[PDB]
Design a protein around this ligand. Structure first.
Ligand SMILES: NC(=O)c1cccc2cn(-c3ccc([C@@H]4CCCNC4)cc3)nc12
Length: 350
């Protein structure tokens, strides 16, 4: 049979299950595709690589000998083979090196999820492969009509919350998808009664979306290094589309990105101006709000189905004694997020 899914949904499935994009991402990370093909990637190996990186992070802060750091570096490259070619393997002896490798592992974890979903399941012929891969996402995906009131609100949110400092590109909404992850409604239900529910942005690389749709937004595993997380291991969101759009890591070569709109149950926010490098919340607080110098104009805030949409144009906040240019929101429980929309964006670079 032929797929009855709308063309934009079919194009989304092709985009998130693109094997060539998975291979190109591994080539960019300088992974040796002969020693470590896409089909050889495993959960166990990525888990053990995170543990090695945490040992490196501990050794660097402890002030361990260069011989122990070299041994941990060598063990990491043995577990994740790299092909540097003309270069000596960079030593993992600083915070920047461990963070670049932890970023690679986060992306490899979701690439492994996408490839294992794609290669799994009943390899029959009765159903269209696009329908088969659609079902592997365990997510209901519907197209939001361009002429709808919903689409108008979302386009206004994209237009008004583009930061002045992120002038490398213009954003254009291609498609708006309404999404419903299986079991997420039931999971979110206890938090639906928490106050201060906001519709916020979450950007990520396109190669992570098969993992995000099938498993939802997740928190970094305990084995992962604690470094590089301004407010600890949690799920981070922005109220400025361009702050999250930067995490799509789109380029002139591939200017099509995916961004989420999630309803997040913030409750009582723990308002911070500087890095806390801690995941523990004070009693009675349900989230962290990192305070930026620029905030969406609160007078243009709208309430949609009991959820605040801060689609106001970026104005000065009043805080100048902060390390953040824009706000960010962090929750430490995966159940405090209900994914609502998925946008396909065109990045028009200057
Ligand atoms: N992804 C986002 O849309 C987003 C919005 C606002 C603030 C954000 C902060 N992040 C974020 C992204 C990545 C990380 C680390 C850094 C590299 C190692 N593992 C993850 C920490 C924070 N992402 C944000």
């Amino acid at each position: 049979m032929k797929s009855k899914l709308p063309k934009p949904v079919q194009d989304l499935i092709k985009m998130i299950f693109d094997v060539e994009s998975m291979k190109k991402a591994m080539v960019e990370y300088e992974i040796d595709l002969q020693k470590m093909p896409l089909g050889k990637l495993s959960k166990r190996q990525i888990q053990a690589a995170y543990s090695i990186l945490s040992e490196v992070q501990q050794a660097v802060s402890q002030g361990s000998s260069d011989s122990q750091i070299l041994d941990l570096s060598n063990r990491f490259y043995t577990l994740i083979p790299h092909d540097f070619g003309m270069k000596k393997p960079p030593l993992l002896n600083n915070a920047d090196s461990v963070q670049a490798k932890a970023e690679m592992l986060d992306n490899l974890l979701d690439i492994e999820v996408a490839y294992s979903l794609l290669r799994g399941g009943s390899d029959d012929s009765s159903k269209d492969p696009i329908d088969v891969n659609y079902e592997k996402l365990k997510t209901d995906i519907k197209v939001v009509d361009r002429d709808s009131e919903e689409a108008e609100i979302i386009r206004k949110y994209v237009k008004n919350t583009h930061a002045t400092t992120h002038n490398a590109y213009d954003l254009e909404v291609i498609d708006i998808f309404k999404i419903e992850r299986e079991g997420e409604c039931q999971r979110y239900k206890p938090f639906k009664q928490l106050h201060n529910r906001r519709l916020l942005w979450h950007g990520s690389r396109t190669t992570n979306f098969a993992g995000i749709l099938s498993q939802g937004l997740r928190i970094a595993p305990p084995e992962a290094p604690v470094t590089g997380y301004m407010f600890g291991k949690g799920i981070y969101f922005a109220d400025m589309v361009s702050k999250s759009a930067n995490y799509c890591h789109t380029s002139q070569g591939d200017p099509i990105g995916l961004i989420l709109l999630g309803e997040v149950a913030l409750g009582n926010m723990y308002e911070l101006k500087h890095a806390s490098h801690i995941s523990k919340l004070p009693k009675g607080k349900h989230s962290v709000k990192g305070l930026g110098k620029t905030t969406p104009d609160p007078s243009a805030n709208i309430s949609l189905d009991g959820v605040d949409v801060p689609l106001g144009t970026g104005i000065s906040s009043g805080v100048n004694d902060t390390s953040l240019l824009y706000n960010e929101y962090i929750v430490y429980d995966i159940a405090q997020v209900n994914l609502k929309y998925l946008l396909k964006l065109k990045f028009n670079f200057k």
